Structure formats: C-alpha cells, structure tokens
Amino acid sequence: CPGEGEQCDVEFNPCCPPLTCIPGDPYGICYII
C-alpha cells in the first residue's frame, strides 16, 4: 500500500494511512481533504 506523497488507486490499492486519494479517477495521490 502507498502513503503520504505517493500515488494511490480507489479500486484495489487504497491509501494505507488515514489519508485521501485525490484525484483517484482511477489513480491519484494521497492527500488530506
């Protein structure tokens, strides 16, 4: 799984830490909303 300042997916590879995946369509970066 990824972390803060890394890319993430909203299908199989979500953000491990309590962070958000933005944009996340399909992929994105782990940011705080």
**Strand residue runs (E) in the chain:** 7-9, 20-23, 27-31
For residue 8, what are the β-bridge partners? 28
Terminal Cα distance for the chain, rounded: 19
Which method resolved this structure?
NMR
All residues at 6 or more sequence positions from 28 whose CB lies less than 8 Å from its CB, including other chains? 7, 8, 9, 10, 21, 22
